[PDB]
Every structure is written in C-alpha cells, then in structure tokens.
Design a protein that fits this description.
This is part of a larger assembly, with three copies of chain A, two copies of chain B and two copies of chain C.
Chain A: E1 4-6, E2 19-29, E3 33-38, E4 45-48, E5 62-66, E6 68-75, E7 85-90
Antiparallel strand pairs in A: 1-2, 2-6, 3-4, 3-7, 5-6
Chain B: E1 44-49, E2 55-56, E3 61-74, E4 89-91, E5 96-99, E6 106-113, E7 118-121, H1 138-141, E8 158-160, E9 172-174, E10 182-189, E11 206-207, E12 222-233, E13 244-246, E14 249-261, H2 266-277
Antiparallel strand pairs in B: 1-12, 2-3, 3-11, 3-14, 4-5, 6-10, 6-12, 7-8, 7-9, 12-13
Chain C: E1 5-6, E2 17-23, E3 27-34, E4 40-42, E5 51-55, E6 60-64, E7 75-80, E8 94-95
Antiparallel strand pairs in C: 1-6, 2-3, 2-7, 3-4, 5-6, 7-8
Classes of the chains: A mainly beta, B mainly beta, C mainly beta.
Chain lengths: 98, 301, 99, 274, 98, 99, 98
C-alpha cells in the first residue's frame, strides 16, 4: 500500500492570500493523483483530477502541479467558498489510499 | 542460451531473465565499447552420442549413421502475445494502453551436421573490447587483437562451434568451408521495430541429402545440432533497456545406417591409435646433432 | 579488510550499488560499482586492490579492501540506484549511513 | 570495397571504416554536387586465372573451361546485431536505448562470367561533379562532359569492369548487351529506414547454363566474378553522417571442360605479318 | 577519467540572496550530472538529478540547468537549511568522478 | 615554405582541421581544410599554391606554403573542429596559438 | 564564394548599453553561422556557434539569432571584458568566408 503524506497539517490564512499544500507518496505514482475538496456536510467534490487538470466548474485560482513522488495544490487568491478540507488521493495501484 | 545463464534458478535473485539477455547498455565513446558478456546472445549447440555400428574388414567397408531428414520448429510464438506487463506502453504520454511487445532484429539459424559447425569471425567495429574471459572472441582464437580485416573477412579468423552458449552470434557466423559435412539454414531480418513473424506446422520436413544423396555422415559417432533464434527485444518502462528474446527450437532428425568405404590403411590408423594413446615424452637426445645412439648394425644371416 | 553493507526494504538483487568514500578534507570520491547482472567497475586509482561483490539472498555488498590498505582512508558509504534496471548510469539517490 | 580503401591498417589513423563508406555530405546548392571518392560504394571484381588447356590449332576444335553452376552467399549478416556502440540511439530525447542498427537502401548484385562485366552509365543527376582522379566516371570514358541523355539510357556511356573498387554503383549498372558471356543477378530495395533481409544456406545452387546449355565459357583463360552488397547506412551520434555497410560475398563455381571451335584465327596473325 | 571543475571555490552570501555555481567537464557528458548537498555530519543528499530535475522533497528555489560541458546550480532565495556543501557529479562513463 | 601545427590531448586523426590566416588590418581569412578522410578544400585565391596535408601518427598538419610566397603574409592559425565526424561543416572552436 | 556584410562598421557604446550587429550573406546559409570574438593579441574565441546557441563559458548577455540571409548578435548589458572585435563566419559551403 502507498502512504500519502501531506506537509501542511492545518493552514490558517485570510482571503486573498496564497496557499500551497504538498503531497508525497511512498512509491512512484506517475501522474495519477486527484485533489478532493470536502465541505462539512457534503460529499467530497473533485477539484483537480490527474494532478494537472481542473475539473469542470472549478475556478482558475486552483492549480495542480507535480508528477512522480511530489505533488502540489495551489490557490493564488482564496475565496469564501474555498473554506473546506482538501485530501490528495493516489489512483495508480490497488488499493487506493487517501 | 542467450545472455542470462540458467543457473540462478530463483525468480528474484536472477530476476529470471532466463531466455532474455540482461540489458543492452550503449557505448560512451567511439573507442570505448564493452558488450558485457551476459548481454550478448550466443550460439546454442548439442551433440547426441549414437552407438557404434558394424564393419567388414574383408572389404574395408564400414557402417555409419546418416542424417536423412529433419523437422524443425521454433516453439512458443503465442507467448509473444503477452501484452500486459511492465514494458514501455504504446501511449507513453500518459503511460496507458499496451506494453509494447517483442519487436526488432530477428535471426533464425539452425544447423544439422555430423561434426561441429565450422564458423567464421566477422564483426562490426573492431575496436570493440569484448571481455577476455567467459566468451569466445576472435582474440581468443588467434591470440592477437582484432584487425580491420576482421571487419570484412579474414580467412584466419575461423573456429568450430565446439562448446555452447559461448560463441556470440554477433561475431561468429556459419562459415562456407571447402568440403562440408553440415547442412545449415538461416535468415535475418534487421530493423528497429520490425514485427516478428513465425510459422508452425508438424507436417513439412527438410531433406538433408547432398547432391549425391549422401547427407551428413556422423564423424566419430556424434550428431551435432546448432541453432540461434533471436525474436527481437523488449523495452522497459525506464531508460529504454532492451533485453533480447529467444525461443527454443525443436529438432527431429531422421537417420539411417549407410555403408561407406574406409579410405585409410589399417596400419596407419593402428599407428595413430598408438601415438594418441601413449604419452609424448622428452628423454635424452637419441636423434639429431647430439645423438647418444653410438652404432647400429643390421644382420641377415 | 572485508566490508559489509546491509540493505532492507526492497529487492536487493534488482538494483545496482556504488561505493563512495569521503576523506574529511578533499570531498567525496567514487570507488566501485556492481549492478544487477553482477559486473564490477572500479575507479582508476583502486583498480587491482579492492574487490566489490554482492551476495544475493543475504542482501549485503562486500567491498573487500585493498588487502594492502596502505594509503586509502576515508568515510566509506553505500549508495543504491533509483530504479531496478540494468542501466549502469542511474543517479543513486539512496546513500548509506557511513563508516 | 566501398569507399574507405583497405590500405591504412591502423584502427586509429584510418578509424577502420574498412567495410564501410567513409561519410556522406549532402550538396550545399543545386548546381554544386561533388560527393567524394571515398564516399561512393563501388563494384568489387576478381579474376581467377585458370590454366591453359589445349593445343589443337590444326583442327577447328579446341577445349576451354565453362562455368556450370555457382553457389553464392553474403557472409556476415548476424554481425548487424551489434546494437551497442556510438550510433544514433533509438530514444533520442534522453539519448538512451539502442544504437540503431544498419538500415536503408540495399543493393545486392553478383555476376559470374568469362569476360569482364559490361556496364552502362545512368545517373540521377547529370550535373554532379565527380572527382576525375581515382574513380571511373562517364566523363573518364566519353572524354566529354555528361549529357542530359545520361539521366536516362544513353547508348554511348558504356564500359567494362577492368578495374576494381573504381566503378561506383551510382553510375555504372550491369548492361544488357545483345551478345553476352556473363550471368548477373541482382535486386535493389530503396527506402530510408528499410530493414535488411538476408538468407544463409549451403543447400541449393544457381545453374549458369544458357538456353542451349553452354554457360559462361572462360575466354582468355580467366573467370571473372563481380559483386556489390550494400546493406544500408549507419547514422552517427552527431551531425547525422550516414555511411554504408557492405558484406563480403562468397562464390563457389563448378567448372567443366568443353570442346569448342577455335577462337584464335591464324589468319589474323598471318595478316598482321603483312 | 573526466575532471569536474567548479568555478566558485567558496561563496559567502546572506539569506535571501542568489547563488549560481557552475561545473565544467573535460569531455562531453550529455545530460548525466547530479547535484549533491552535504551538511556536515550527514550522508550527501541528492538535490538535482540528471541536471534538469529536482529530486522529491527539494524546494523550488533550487534549479539545475545546462547540458554538455557547462552545467549550473542556482538558488534564488537562500534559506537557513541551505548552508551546506554542494558537489557536482558526472554519471556518464566509468569511472564516475565528483 | 612548409608549416607545422602540433596538437596533443586527443585523437588527432578523427578531427578535421582548418587553416585561418589574419593580416593585422583586414581581419581573418580562411585558407584550407582537411578532414578525417583526408580531402583538401582550399580558398579561391590560394587554390593552386598551398597544399594542406596531415601526417597521422605524428599529429601535425603541414600547410606547404605557396612555393612562390609573393603577396601572402599574415598570422597563420590552426583550428580543430568540435566533434570527431566526417561532417565538413563543424564550427571549429579550438583555435591555435598563431604564428 | 559567399560574401558576408556587416551593418555596423564601428559601434561606440558605454558599459550597460545594448548593441546589435547584423550580418548578411549573398546566398542562403540555413543556420550555419558562427560569431567570433577577437581581443587584440589573442586567438579568436568562439562565442555563438550555429547562430542560435552559446558556446560554453559565454555569459547570458550574448545572444545569436536569425536564420537564412540575415543573422544578428546582441548584447543587452555590455561588460568590460566585451571590448573586442566581432566577426561573423558562414560555415555552409566551401570556401568559408569571414
């Protein structure tokens, strides 16, 4: 099983600032990494699929980058509707880990 | 037998590239080039020891085996249909699709004879520094280095396919000698992505008879088979290392007993047997300039 | 005169391992290399003296030292390549502890 | 013998492109092509001098040699499996993979005869400036510049295979003269990346007999063998300089003696005396 | 053997500044050059592999560039954890030289 | 009337070498070229007079001068190409000392 | 023979300024043009080979551009060590001309 570790445990930041959360996988996952946004009380919504594209309806402030062992999700100017938890998921082997 | 030897029987320590070469690493300069023995595909050979036969010294006539025909077949082509696995993918941008199967320069040669295959040395670039131990190179036979005439044809760089798995196919090619007792067939197909092609059937044979209908008579009593079947090379999902692939060849030889005339005098080969059985010694000089033999007398009566 | 470098957590015999020694003052210095298909490549100064080997199924390289050991002294490291290939040039990122 | 001559024997001074053309440098402008002497692959020929047979110059009959059959084979195919070394690699973005093998246009011709091969001149470009020293060209034989009729068949540009390693194959082709004492076989395969194909065997032969069952009668007393075997070009890990590879060809000829009518007319001598 | 020569023997610079260290190889090494960071008392850590990529976990201030005979390692804004020695290594022929 | 240009540190016969002469006032001026497969290419003004040659295994080019030597005077240089090819146009970066 | 003509016969400019010298060839030279720097008393050093690359050791202020009949060499910020003559050379046919 692959273990996904995220560098920022919790980030406190205001509106208009920039955040970057990184993810590290024990083994190589080529480009198969998704970025999920979960607002409290909702099913987790897909934000950044395959680590380099933006799912439809997602604004241009969200950016996914990286490939291999180190991935990153970046937000340039935060918005009020971006106040949710963010999980990174490897989908490159079985079993998938969050 | 091409590259990886069969000895590390485990599928984790040898990776079990058995049946594949180990990995083709290129050269670092024009003058520096070392092919790394476990990379080079080599000739496969075998010898069947047949029994001794009758004779008739009243007529100086012998009996010896005579390979009349052969059915060959390269077994295991459908194996190349394994298109899963961790090879280079067809859609490489996303690493999806199909693992690129075995493709490339293929080389199918076989040979059935009554004595070991006589072969010739002929190489590409002759600066190539082959490992001087564990493989038979043109330097191993003629004890000097390679020359430029080993790049086209040197009637000096000859050898016999005597051991096994040691004469790299890239150096030693079946040699058309003057008078030959071996039938060898072969075909080559170069390129980098040439699709392999193969055929099976258990119906059609090959006739080994000569123009006089004599076929390969077995010297000694052994029947020699030789073959190489390179089917291409595979690429790993990494630096594109290029392990070769080869498939086993099945021979079915049909022999019979033929009467032949013993062309040598019996006394000559008796003396030869005695000279080969006895040691070859030194001793005090009893011939030449410092003979210790003093006198010799010959009487009759 | 015989080193030993234990490794764990992977398939030992699918990777190529280098030896790099560092004297405290003149920096790092490559020594030897043995790949998956065991074939030894040495540095120019240490050609005939050291012998790098690996015993598969035991997971330890043995850099048998110079057997003379006169003027060679440094911190001896181990390095494992990044990928499990028969490619010789693979930018070993996994250094040892040092000795 | 295709390009690089055999003479400089060292593997450093000559680099030993023996068995390889030297290098290929394209033209710089349309009007200025002057390839090289060591770049052009040329014909290989040899003459076996057979002994003199008879002295029946009193009856019209006389006996001389006759090639009955041939067994040929291009030896050295498997050597093309050397995929180490410094050629352009298979995967060029990282410069890794396999040093690409020999591919390209290939050209196999051989010819067994009693008199030297009769050749015909036909060039792709009649404005190419071949060096007039060390190579035989349509100019060397017609003594004038090349005509536009030399891009197609011109019955004037005819020659023989006197020399060896002198007649390039981009110019001189086996000529179908009306009365011929030579059997020549050949095949050509173009392309820039065509894979080579070859065939070993020591099994079956070629019959050199004519429709009347005569076959090449060795006039004079010599037997002339000619061949060219181009397998393709290797592209270096540089400015992509291709250069050809050629493999040696082995001939085995079966000769028998045949009674013919006298080709030495004494009238010629007893008329040269006048 | 290839000899690797580095132009800056020692660079003294504060935090927030830029440094560029170059490396020259006697013969051509196509793109096979690694950049190693050694902190005193630690095994040398890989920073920039193959002269154009950043090993996982290494921040974006590190940059490797160049190909052939001249390579370079650049740091835009230094950090306290970048106070270590830096070696460039050719891995293109045997023997490897540091 | 016979120059000499010694070179060392490489394989001499795998590279192509140019001759470039510079008169102090009118700039540089190409003269001749000899490649690996020795084949001489000259400038238009100096075609019949100079002869560039190379003696392999001795590592020196000989630009045998005009044999007339009337109106040709300049600083004579040597240049070695960058790569060891049979490609004629290879942007020689390694100039000589000058004479 | 190809004749190479250079537009600036002599340019006088201080340190920190920009210079652009152009070169024109009578016939088409595809991309085979070199740019040579000669300091008085030295052998001419190669600066810009093949009209689009920088020889090793040459700083980033030097730039070569153009292809065909019109080439150019540009320097953004001059330096004291850039006070030398500059020749453009076509290497595309024989004889080479400077």
């Amino acid at each position: 099983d692959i273990v996904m570790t995220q560098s920022p445990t919790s980030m406190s930041i205001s509106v208009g600032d920039r955040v970057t959360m990184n993810c590290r996988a024990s083994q190589n996952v080529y480009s198969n990494v998704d970025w999920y946004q979960q607002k409290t009380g909702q099913s987790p919504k897909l934000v950044i699929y395959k680590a380099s594209n933006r799912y439809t309806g997602v604004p241009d402030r969200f950016t996914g980058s990286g490939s291999g062992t180190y991935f990153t999700l970046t937000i340039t100017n935060i918005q009020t509707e971006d106040l949710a938890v963010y999980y990174c998921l490897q989908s490159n082997a079985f079993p998938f880990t969050f | 037998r091409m590259g990886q030897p069969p000895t590390p029987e485990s599928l984790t320590e040898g990776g079990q590239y058995y049946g594949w070469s180990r990995g083709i690493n290129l050269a670092t300069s024009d003058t520096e080039d070392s092919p790394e023995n476990n990379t080079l595909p080599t000739w496969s050979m075998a010898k069947l020891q047949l029994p001794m036969l009758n004779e008739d010294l009243t007529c100086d006539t012998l009996q010896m085996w005579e390979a009349v025909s052969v059915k060959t077949e390269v077994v295991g082509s459908g194996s190349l249909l394994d298109v899963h696995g961790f090879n280079k993918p067809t859609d490489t941008v996303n690493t999806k699709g199909i693992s690129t199967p075995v493709e490339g320069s293929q080389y199918h040669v076989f040979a059935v004879g009554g004595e070991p295959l006589d072969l010739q040395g002929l190489v590409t670039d002759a600066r190539t520094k082959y490992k001087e131990e564990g493989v038979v190179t043109i330097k191993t036979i003629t004890k000097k280095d390679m020359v430029n005439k080993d790049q086209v044809l040197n009637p000096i760089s000859k050898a016999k396919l005597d051991k096994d798995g040691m004469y790299p196919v890239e150096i030693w090619h079946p040699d058309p000698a003057k008078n030959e007792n071996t039938r060898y067939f072969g075909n080559y197909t170069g390129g980098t992505t040439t699709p392999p092609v193969l055929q099976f059937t258990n119906t059609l044979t090959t006739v080994l008879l000569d123009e006089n209908g004599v076929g390969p008579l077995c010297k000694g009593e052994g029947l020699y088979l030789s073959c190489v079947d390179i089917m291409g090379w595979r690429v790993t999902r990494n630096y594109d290392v290029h392990h070769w692939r080869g498939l086993p060849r099945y021979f079915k030889i049909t022999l019979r007993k033929r009467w032949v005339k013993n062309p040598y005098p019996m006394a000559s080969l008796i003396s030869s047997l005695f000279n080969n059985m006895l040691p070859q010694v030194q001793g005090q000089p009893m011939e030449g300039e410092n003979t210790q033999v003093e006198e010799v007398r010959v009487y009759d009566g | 005169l015989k080193l030993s470098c234990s490794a764990s957590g992977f398939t030992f015999s699918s990777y190529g391992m280098h030896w790099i020694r560092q004297v405290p003052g003149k920096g790092l210095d490559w020594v030897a290399y043995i790949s998956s298909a065991s074939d030894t490549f040495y540095a120019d100064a240490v050609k005939e003296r050291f012998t790098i080997s690996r015993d598969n199924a035991k997971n330890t390289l043995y850099l048998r030292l110079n057997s003379l050991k006169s003027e060679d002294t440094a911190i001896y490291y181990c390095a494992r390549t990044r990928y499990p290939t028969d490619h010789f040039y693979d930018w070993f990122p996994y250094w040892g502890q040092g000795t």
